[PDB]
Design a protein around this ligand. Structure first.
Ligand SMILES: OC[C@@H]1[C@@H](O)[C@H](O)[C@@H](O)c2nc(CCCc3ccccc3)cn21
Ligand SMILES: [Zn+2]
Ligand SMILES: [Zn+2]
Length: 998
């Protein structure tokens, strides 16, 4: 294993380092507005050194944006694919690339066998080439690496299964900035090459000047370079035809033959004839040779396409016939020294690697990311890190439910009548669809966001049905287990989605001596280690005690059920209560507990006090402790031996103390607002264009609720637009915000932490929940350029102290000053930001955001070199993130009686090292397969050293006949394991295994 802390990689281009050196001057470069007038020596080219030009036809198909997936399919995409099948069949030299497998699968399944075989023939002869082959072309900012892998696996499994092809070249022309998470997954998925487009205009110029637009993209911690993937960055403003032939879009637009739609430079395309072909070819080859000066080989990529292009058969004809006339002329005239032809992406990369093998070029190394993206001036695309934050949170919930459902159902082979495979396939595809760069980003029209939401709701329900069937099977004696595959044996209880304040939907367990004295509940732990977590349930009485199925008492706490109403005041339930207790659940396992009613106060159940700080002072039915009242004031709570927390008069954190003999370190939560410019460019779904720094929110004298208990305590307050809550369970606290931005038009609400940590200009954000990247705040860039994706975490630190904020949802954030962290909560925007959506963001809905807040001492931790581009979490911050993203699942038994009930599953499962995760467990075979196969993805993170059994997934199921190390998609074997034992994986490595069983 490489060390990833002490060694700093030696790369030609390190993007944080380059960012420090770059001026970011926004100079008019001429016809290439954001570059310079390209010059080439024409005697560069001769019969022995010709330019080789691949013209690569394509059609950018958004799986939802202005229209829904199905709308686009019926209106556009089905015609594009019908015409591709017809035109490529009929024209053997014509080529086409396709990226979105969601659309291709939707099309292919609707064809007759003859059309299906026609399609196979134009894929096998290489006319139609799949690029990437994901379900979508995913967002790279907000997306979790697990969901990027899921949608890649879903697309590539479809291609392998139905087309017998696995792409090794990736095409990502539209995501709004690019993440090194992509090459990481792609290079561990058998890829050899990738292509990106949307990078800062200043970055394109800088790399172009050094011919560093092709580079070996390695991870920021990779010393050796084994993660390196060859990457082609396109040089110009767009993927459209005016911005892909060469530097002058007025010229390139004349070779978009569909525009004879028109050219905004006001020179239309001309039909190619014997009369003008010499002149037209001279214009075009001049553009090609200028573009070729920016790259190191004599092999040139010329994409030919745009949004939903190649829809009409007359577009196919007008593009094909005019380019054939150009190629015929150019190829036959020696003076050009060009060979031009329709090609695919793989053909381009194959030719580039031939030129490299033959010493014609060596490529530079690069580490870093391409956030935050700007397409022009100060138009930074940090808005979509936050846009439609309800659906951004829903992504993380469904992420976990798909993992839980695949893992719980993987333990057994299921009869086809259970429809397990059908529900999981639906769940994977709706979650995969939402990874789209107009899904999770929140950049689609109102009705399309509604479609994504309804699809993810159906996916959640499918997961619940699979999970409850699986739990019933795993915990019922096989001698009794006699399933009805349509029955609800359990209902799921989730206290964090949607959240009781968003939707009052949690079921109450109704107990009573006559009606039903006791209720079985079951916790699932998807993580491969022993876990204790407080869990809660709604119960109809406060007189409830908890036992395991062995009748061992379990210490519990009962709290009232509070909700908040309209200024903003709490109300207690007189009819339902929260029972809280510590579930202990095996690795990848289940634990059964029992809730029982009694006459009076149980022996092992404590009751919380309830202080309502307010100026002019509530029943709680049977709740044994009366609500106490007071005037606003400073309060201080400790739970267990964990941190002591001081809160302001207004119910917001002001200080944390770690241990009894620790200093009270200050940490001030504060809600500010950003506004929208009245003059010049407007913030919208994409762009963050603040009219200056944020100004404090008008807090007033808000009602403050303090709940104090042995196991769990809480401070809630009803601030305008936010119900803010700090929850203490005896480690790092949990923050919940119920955010209702209401009708505050042209507002972005931000949550800031003000510390005295001596961070300076340094801060750390994660990429795709996989790695933490060093950020430097740059005063030479505007505020919106210092905003980065916060997909799972952010942190600041000096020599002694670190504060880490973990998120249950991707949001935008920064450290705009020494010892600050800030993260945006919601944004309501009356204006369009001129990126084609043609609406503002006025469809806000109440969302419950969740966080863990981890103040630590790091002076005794091995931190990486001051030069290292990476950061690493501590064990505590990492476990806190795991608590947010993969909590214990809760199941309530539906019926009165459970004959066969067992207490535990997975008691014998290995409790793997804290830094290892079974990211994926998925059974790969149906019941009708002679040999059962199960795929595992294992991820080992890297935790900071500050001062467990071996997990072999090959042997997790019995009767292992074979084990393979595979690509992350499970689609190819990389290493036969003779000992059928999985070698363990290095820090910051992700590996996949497929185990066979006889
Ligand atoms: O800008 C980003 C979005 C992105 O969200 C989509 O996923 C991507 O496919 C896309 N295509 C366009 C075309 C430009 C709009 C237009 C077209 C003619 C006239 C006026 C405006 C915009 N976008
Ligand atoms: Zn797009
Ligand atoms: Zn083998």
């Amino acid at each position: 294993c490489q060390d990833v802390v002490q060694d700093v990689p030696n790369v030609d281009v390190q993007m944080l380092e380059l960012y420090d050196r770059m001026s970011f001057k926004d100079i008019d470069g001429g016809v290439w507005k954001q570059g310079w007038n390209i010059k080439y020596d024409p005697l560069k080219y001769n019969a022995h050194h010709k330019l080789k030009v691949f013209v690569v036809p394509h059609s950018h198909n958004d799986p939802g944006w202005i229209q829904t997936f199905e709308e686009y399919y019926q209106h556009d995409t089905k015609h594009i694919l019908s015409n591709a099948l017809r035109h490529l069949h009929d024209n053997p030299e014509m080529k086409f690339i396709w990226a979105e497998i969601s659309y291709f699968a939707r099309f292919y399944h609707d064809l007759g066998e003859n059309k299906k075989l026609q399609m196979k023939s134009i894929v096998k002869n290489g006319q139609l080439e799949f690029v990437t082959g994901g379900w979508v072309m995913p967002d790279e900012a907000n997306s979790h690496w697990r969901n990027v892998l899921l949608q890649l696996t879903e697309g590539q499994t479809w291609l392998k299964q139905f087309m017998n092809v696995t792409p090794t070249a990736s095409w990502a022309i539209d995501p709004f900035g690019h993440s090194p998470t992509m090459p990481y997954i792609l290079q561990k998925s058998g890829f050899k090459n990738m292509l990106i487009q949307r990078t800062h205009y200043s970055v394109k110029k800088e790399l172009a000047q050094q011919r560093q637009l092709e580079f070996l993209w390695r991870q920021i911690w990779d010393n050796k370079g084994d993660t390196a993937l060859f990457t082609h960055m396109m040089p110009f403003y767009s993927y459209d035809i005016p911005h892909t032939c060469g530097p002058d879009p007025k010229v390139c637009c004349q070779f978009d033959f569909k525009r004879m739609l028109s050219c905004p430079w006001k020179v239309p395309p001309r039909t190619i004839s014997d009369q003008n072909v010499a002149a037209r070819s001279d214009l075009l080859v001049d553009q090609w040779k200028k573009k070729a000066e920016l790259y190191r080989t004599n092999v040139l990529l010329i994409p030919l396409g745009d949004d939903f292009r190649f829809k009409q058969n007359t577009e196919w004809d007008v593009q094909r016939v005019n380019y054939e006339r150009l190629f015929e002329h150019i190829n036959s005239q020696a003076h050009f020294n060009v060979q031009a032809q329709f090609g695919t992406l793989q053909e381009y990369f194959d030719a580039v690697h031939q030129a490299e093998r033959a010493g014609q070029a060596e490529f530079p190394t690069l580490s870093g990311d391409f956030f935050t993206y700007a397409d022009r001036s100060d138009n930074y695309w940090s808005g979509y890190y936050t846009s439609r934050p309800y659906h951004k949170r829903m992504d993380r919930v469904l992420m976990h439910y798909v993992r839980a459902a695949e893992m719980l159902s993987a333990w057994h082979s299921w009869d086809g009548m259970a429809r397990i495979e059908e529900r999981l396939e639906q769940a994977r595809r709706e979650l995969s669809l939402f990874q789209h760069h107009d899904g999770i980003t929140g950049t689609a029209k109102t009705h399309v966001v509604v479609d994504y939401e309804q699809r993810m709701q159906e996916a959640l329900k499918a997961c619940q049905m699979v999970m409850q069937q699986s739990v019933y099977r795993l915990l019922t004696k096989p001698s009794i287990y006699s399933p009805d595959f349509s029955f609800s044996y359990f209902t799921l209880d989730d206290s964090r989605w949607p959240g009781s304040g968003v939707e009052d939907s949690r079921t109450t367990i109704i107990l009573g001596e006559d009606i039903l004295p006791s209720k079985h509940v079951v916790m699932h732990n998807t993580l491969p280690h022993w876990r204790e977590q407080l869990v809660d349930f709604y119960v109809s009485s406060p007189f409830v005690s908890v036992t395991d199925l062995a009748n061992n008492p379990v210490e519990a706490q009962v709290s009232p059920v509070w909700s908040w109403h309209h200024t903003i005041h709490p109300q207690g339930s007189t009819t339902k209560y929260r029972i809280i207790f510590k579930a202990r659940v095996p690795p990848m396992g289940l634990a059964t507990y029992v809730l029982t009613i009694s006459d009076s106060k149980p022996e092992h159940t404590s009751y919380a006090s309830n202080l309502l700080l307010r100026k002019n002072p509530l029943p709680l039915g049977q709740y044994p402790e009366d609500v106490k009242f007071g005037d606003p004031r400073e309060i201080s709570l400790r739970v267990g031996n964990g941190p002591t927390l001081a809160f302001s008069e207004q119910g917001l954190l002001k200080s944390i103390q770690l241990t009894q003999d620790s200093p009270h370190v200050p940490v001030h939560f504060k809600f500010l607002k950003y506004g929208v410019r009245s003059h010049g460019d407007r913030s919208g779904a994409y762009l963050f264009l603040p009219n200056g720094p944020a100004s404090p929110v008008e807090l007033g004298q808000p009602v403050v609720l303090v709940t104090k208990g042995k196991l769990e305590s809480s401070v809630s307050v009803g601030l305008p637009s936010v119900v803010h809550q700090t929850i203490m369970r005896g480690g790092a606290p949990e923050i919940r915000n119920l955010v209702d931005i209401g009708s505050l038009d042209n507002t972005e609400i931000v949550m800031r932490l003000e510390t005295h940590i001596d961070s300076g200009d340094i801060f750390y954000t994660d990429l795709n929940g996989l790695q933490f990247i060093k950020r430097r705040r740059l005063d030479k860039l505007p505020l919106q350029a210092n905003y980065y994706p916060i997909p799972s975490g952010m942190f600041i630190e000096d020599a002694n102290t670190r504060l880490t904020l973990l998120t249950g949802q991707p949001l935008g954030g920064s450290s705009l000053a020494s010892g600050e962290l800030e993260i945006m909560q919601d944004r309501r925007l009356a204006s369009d930001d001129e990126r084609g959506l043609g609406q503002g963001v006025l469809d806000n809905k109440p969302v419950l955001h969740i966080y863990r807040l981890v103040l630590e001492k790091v002076n005794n931790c091995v931190r990486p070199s001051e030069l290292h581009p990476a950061g690493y979490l501590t064990s505590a911050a990492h476990k806190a993130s795991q608590s947010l993203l993969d909590p214990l699942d809760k199941f309530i038994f539906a019926e009165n009686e459970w004959i066969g009930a067992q207490g535990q599953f997975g008691g014998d499962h290995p409790s793997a090292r804290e830094d290892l995760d079974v990211s994926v467990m998925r059974r790969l075979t149906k019941s009708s397969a002679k040999t059962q196969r199960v795929g595992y993805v294992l991820h080992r993170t890297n935790l900071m050293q500050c001062g467990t059994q071996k997990l072999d997934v090959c042997h997790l199921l019995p009767n292992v006949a074979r084990c393979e190390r595979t690509t992350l998609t499970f689609l190819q074997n990389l290493e036969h394991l003779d000992g059928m034992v999985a070698p363990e994986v290095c820090p910051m490595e992700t590996a996949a295994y497929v185990s066979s069983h006889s």
